Amino acid sequence: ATLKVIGVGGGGNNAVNRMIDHGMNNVEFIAINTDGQALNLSKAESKIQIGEKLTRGLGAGANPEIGKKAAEESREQIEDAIQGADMVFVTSGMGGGTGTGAAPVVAKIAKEMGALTVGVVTRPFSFEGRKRQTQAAAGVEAMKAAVDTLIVIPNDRLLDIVDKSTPMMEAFKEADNVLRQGVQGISDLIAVSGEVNLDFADVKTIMSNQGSALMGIGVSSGENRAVEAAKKAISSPLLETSIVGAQGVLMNITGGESLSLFEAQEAADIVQDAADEDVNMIFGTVINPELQDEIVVTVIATGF
Ligand SMILES: Nc1nc2c(ncn2[C@@H]2O[C@H](COP(=O)(O)OP(=O)(O)O)[C@@H](O)[C@H]2O)c(=O)[nH]1
Ligand SMILES: NC(=O)c1c(F)ccc(OCc2nc3cc(Cl)cnc3s2)c1F
Ligand SMILES: [Ca+2]
């Protein structure tokens, strides 16, 4: 199963750069921008410049109709870079000319290519103004209508998690983690055969043609570890779509040899509970004798 991550527009291309610096193996990156200046600064291996005729190497100047046309224009170019993919992650910052327009086109194409297509998009800060927020909203709606599942990260949520001196770039990589853990998480699942095994078909079942989505992970050790880790995996300080309301959950617990049946029920009860719905769950377990005392709990919840 081939996963590609594609950032669209400046923010999404900054996400691709920081993820890459982090080192993400077996995932192919694709940078898409109208602004050739930034694109040339990408560490993405596969680089597509969109709307060259339209913008002449510049960005879309806040006009999503430019970014939309620009991606339509280079449609074939995007199709090729996508080609061979089983699952694609389209990541972008809503509210600009390029992401708000092109990203939903890019996501459309991916789906048409038969790829499981997931978007991780930001909503703009309230301080950016009312107009940029309305434009982003339209983009989010377009995203929803082009994807299999969507995660929305309101940039305003970052204000919840910083003190007055936390640098902006440090607030940003906090947001990076949502997508990054999502991708690495789904990558391990595929890679390893667990003792209660989940695979890409289980991923497809839970994420295809859904709507909103939650992706999360929690780590704990100590005595309430399972319940602790499970709480963290559905914790949503930066999330717009909360766990509550969820019809479907794919869930996995990784621990060492000491993983007990009892603590696994504790963790699952927590999730099924917090949804406070009749969750159709797909459960999995991994035993990594390396892990010893740590417990990892991972969630993909949809069906709202
Ligand atoms: N969280 C986050 N948001 C960003 C980042 N860069 C840009 N944005 C947001 O995305 C919106 C669009 O900006 P950008 O993606 O650079 O413009 P575009 O290239 O024309 O799509 C802005 O209003 C910002 O809220 C980033 O690095 N992190
Ligand atoms: N039982 C299995 O087949 C298996 C495995 F052998 C290794 C890892 C697994 O889960 C890894 C994940 N990590 C994450 C992170 C987020 Cl943010 C969301 N969902 C997931 S799923 C599994 F489900
Ligand atoms: Ca597996």
Swiss-Prot record:
Positions that bind GTP: 10-14, 18, 60-62, 97-99, 128, 132, 155, 176
Keyword GTP-binding belongs to the record: yes
Record localization: Cytoplasm
One GO cellular component term noted in the UniProt record for this chain: cytoplasm
One Gene Ontology biological process: protein polymerization
Summary of activators and inhibitors of this protein: Calcium ions inhibit the GTPase activity and promote the polymerization of FtsZ.
Top-rank taxon, per record: Bacteria
Keywords: Cell cycle, Cell division, Cytoplasm, GTP-binding, Nucleotide-binding, Septation
Gene Ontology terms for molecular function: GTP binding; GTPase activity
Function (record text): Essential cell division protein that forms a contractile ring structure (Z ring) at the future cell division site. The regulation of the ring assembly controls the timing and the location of cell division. One of the functions of the FtsZ ring is to recruit other cell division proteins to the septum to produce a new cell wall between the dividing cells. Binds GTP and shows GTPase activity.
Protein family per UniProt: Belongs to the FtsZ family.
Quaternary assembly: Homodimer. Polymerizes to form a dynamic ring structure in a strictly GTP-dependent manner. Interacts directly with several other division proteins.
Protein name: Cell division protein FtsZ
Organism: Staphylococcus aureus (strain Mu50 / ATCC 700699)
Taxonomic lineage of the native organism: Bacteria, Bacillati, Bacillota, Bacilli, Bacillales
Originating gene: ftsZ
Part of the intact protein present: 12 to 315 of 390
